[PDB]
């Protein structure tokens, strides 16, 4: 199948320098045109540069936007695609997608220009509550707290644990730090026999935890 | 730069409902039109290109149509999996641009909220900060208040909410509220309510504890 994987994004202080990459499979490369598109919640999906194939020798355009701080390049020997981006903006901040002809998307890699300090997570857990419930349902989960840039990613019991599981989106505090919560539906009864374990990682920090939550 | 306006900017449809949604642009695209489809924290997924053309392994359901400066996407028969925001796209021209967007919601009975509270643990107590979290999960529809009060005084200002988007497999949304106070200010407190108002509760439910008590 078509795969895209894009890589390269990070934390950036304004006016600095960040190369992306996108590692393509699955189809000739050498004959697809590719696109970079970046996402914020403030404007939506924007097309940022494109790169022809052989048909137009390479040729390459640009939003007004990026012109003169970004260039597009690729490597058809190595099946890549690369975004330099020079000259940073806090706006620039945002999602990078890789594209094949507007027809497949990579999963993303996330850029963050700001000024403000890597910052692992804290992770607390949530526990179950001693109070029994009705119907014998319990809701436990991790609050992963003051964390910068995103993302996290959180799993249950090193994955075996997906049913009944919620991640909440992630608020940004006054403090200009991430934080966000990880919670299961589980058997009461279970509270006493069955371990759970939420396992935390910030690769931007390079933390990884995992925490036990436990009643009491 | 052309200008694609999507519209309807959000709705709702029940399953099953056939559902329409247009993109114009400012000039004559001569058909160069493309449909996404994108899901909460994944990436765009196309659905359509050339106006009218699927993808390979599109479900059948999703049509397109248009030409010149209008342009529809029609979903036939609404199943869970549609859900989610979709955009579409010009590459008739340079700079390419896209829509602003249609956020599809599906519409399904209401679902009252079940309701945990989680005082701090004593392991961030050591930090001098105290995060109390109110979790409603699983509701339908998202309107829901939440009321946090500590010693039965109203707060304001100092919780924040996080939502998910509707749940793929049950068309509901889970809430989180996170109450967060110093440690001193929790410490000198007692009682600690979460109070959920939501139309699918007769009356508003409270979840409680005594700050210290198993
Ligand atoms: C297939 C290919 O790469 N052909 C390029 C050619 O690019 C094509 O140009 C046409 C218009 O002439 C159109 O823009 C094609 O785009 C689409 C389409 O709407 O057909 C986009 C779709 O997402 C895509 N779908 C999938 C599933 O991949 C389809 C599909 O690839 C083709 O229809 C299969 O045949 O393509 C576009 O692919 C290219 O033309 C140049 O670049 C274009 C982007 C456009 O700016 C043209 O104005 C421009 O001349 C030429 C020259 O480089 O090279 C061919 O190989
Ligand atoms: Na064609």
């Known amino acids: 199948e078509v795969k895209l994987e894009e890589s390269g994004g990070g934390l950036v202080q304004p006016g600095g320098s960040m190369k992306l990459s996108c590692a393509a499979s699955?189809?000739?490369?050498?004959?697809?045109?590719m696109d970079w598109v970046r996402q914020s919640p403030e404007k939506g999906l924007e097309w940022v540069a494109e790169?022809?194939?052989?048909?137009?020798?390479?040729?390459?355009y640009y939003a007004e936007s990026v012109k003169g701080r970004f260039t597009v390049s690729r490597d058809d020997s190595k099946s890549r695609v690369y975004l330099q981006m020079n000259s940073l903006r806090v706006e620039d901040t945002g999602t990078y997608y890789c594209?094949?002809?507007?027809?497949?998307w990579g999963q993303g890699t996330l850029v963050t220009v700001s000024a403000a300090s890597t910052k692992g997570p804290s992770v607390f857990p949530l526990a179950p509550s001693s109070k029994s419930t009705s119907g014998g349902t319990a809701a436990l989960g991790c609050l992963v707290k003051d964390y910068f840039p995103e993302p996290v990613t959180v799993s249950w019991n090193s994955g075996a644990l997906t049913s009944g599981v919620h991640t909440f989106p992630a608020v940004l505090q006054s403090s200009g730090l991430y934080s966000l919560s990880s919670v299961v539906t589980v058997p009461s009864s279970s509270l006493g026999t069955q371990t759970y374990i939420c396992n935390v990682n910030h690769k931007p920090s390079n933390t990884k935890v995992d925490k036990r939550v436990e009643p009491k | 730069d052309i200008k694609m306006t999507q519209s309807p900017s959000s709705m709702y449809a029940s399953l099953g409902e056939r559902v329409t949604i247009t993109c114009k642009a400012s000039?004559?695209?001569?058909?160069?039109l493309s449909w996404f489809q994108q899901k909460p924290g994944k990436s765009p997924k196309t659905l359509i290109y050339?106006?009218?053309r699927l993808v390979d392994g599109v479900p059948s359901r999703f049509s397109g149509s248009g030409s010149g400066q209008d342009y529809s996407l029609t979903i036939s028969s609404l199943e869970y999996e549609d859900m989610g925001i979709y955009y579409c796209?010009?590459?008739?021209?340079?700079?390419?641009?896209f829509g602003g967007g249609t956020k599809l919601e599906i519409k399904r009975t209401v679902a009252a909220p079940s309701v945990f509270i989680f005082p701090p643990s004593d392991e961030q107590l050591k930090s001098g900060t105290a995060s109390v979290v109110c979790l409603l999960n699983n509701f339908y529809p998202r309107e829901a208040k939440v009321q946090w009060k500590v010693d039965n005084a109203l707060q304001s200002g100092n919780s924040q909410e996080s939502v998910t988007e509707q749940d793929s497999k049950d068309s509901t949304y889970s809430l989180s509220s996170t109450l967060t106070l110093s440690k001193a200010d929790y410490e000198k407190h007692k009682v600690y309510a979460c109070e959920v108002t939501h139309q699918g509760l007769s009356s508003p439910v409270t979840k409680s504890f005594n700050r210290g008590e198993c």
């Open positions: 050339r106006a009218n």
């Open positions: 790169i022809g194939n052989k048909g137009n020798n390479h040729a390459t």
């Open positions: 000039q004559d695209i001569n058909s160069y």
């Open positions: 594209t094949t002809r507007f027809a497949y």
């Open positions: 796209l010009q590459y008739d021209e340079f700079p390419r641009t």
């Open positions: 699955g189809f000739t490369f050498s004959d697809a045109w």
